[PDB]
Amino acid sequence: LEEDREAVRREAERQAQAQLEKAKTKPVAFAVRTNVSYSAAHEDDVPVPGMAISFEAKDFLHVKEKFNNDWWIGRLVKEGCEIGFIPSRVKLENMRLQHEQRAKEFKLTPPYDVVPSMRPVVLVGPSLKGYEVTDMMQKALFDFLKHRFEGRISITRVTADISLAKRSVLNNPSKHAIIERSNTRSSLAEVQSEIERIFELARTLQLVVLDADTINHPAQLSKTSLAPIVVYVKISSPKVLQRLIKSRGKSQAKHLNVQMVAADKLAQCPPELFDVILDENQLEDACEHLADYLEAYWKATHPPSS
């Protein structure tokens, strides 16, 4: 009767437990940013009781392996989350239909977006790239990161305009899509190639840092599939920026005006569009701030198991 159903569920739990444990040290198959929240609190046929992964919308998940059509094995990208069971999109959509059927009975779109397995770090500010103050100030930060995270870091130049890398544009198989692109910046093929280059650089869970020439503002990457960590190098006083640009001679100074415009553009950007804001006066202090953030990220994406 019920005692043999319990024997079947007990052994099966043990198989799942074993799969789960074996998957602990496995590489990440892919990453997702979630579009929906999921709570495991109230359900059965979860492969191992208490082991389902609950998550909020906009959380990042690392998927390691397929358990079955309903469940994958992976983890919430968060310092102490261990492996667990994540509901597949099919399950989540079935849960949505069941919720809709319940709703009718009262008689009163993609849950997961694929993302790089490590969020690429992007630097914006204090002003426009291709000018000396911003370029020199970012170079300093890039040199530090190469040192502080040597062995765990990949810093790469991206000249291609990855701002054109809107997710829908890149999924579009149609050979007619090109006739919609008024003057293109760079080529969408090259952009796609470059996006896959970034996904690939992060596949082994090393920190990825992009030196992205075309990105001066977070809104240029928000529609993309990169889910970057956007680090805002902020000079708080415009008077300071003006003087810094003037320190670089008459040529640089001739474009004081555009430079101050971009700076002010970033300055009115909502704080929520950035992941980190480095407004420290001293390189050493900004560097430490950035390292603390990236070290915690490292811990979110690795800690004890591997």
């Binding site: 370029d135 020199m136 300093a140 040199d143 008077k239 300071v240 810094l244 320190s247 006066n281 390189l283």
Partner: peptide
């Protein structure tokens, strides 16, 4: 505080040469 900002930011720039 402007002199502080400037001096720190100036040496930061020099580190980016």
């Amino acid at each position: 505080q402007l002199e502080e900002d400037l001096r720190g930011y100036m040496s930061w720039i020099t580190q980016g040469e």
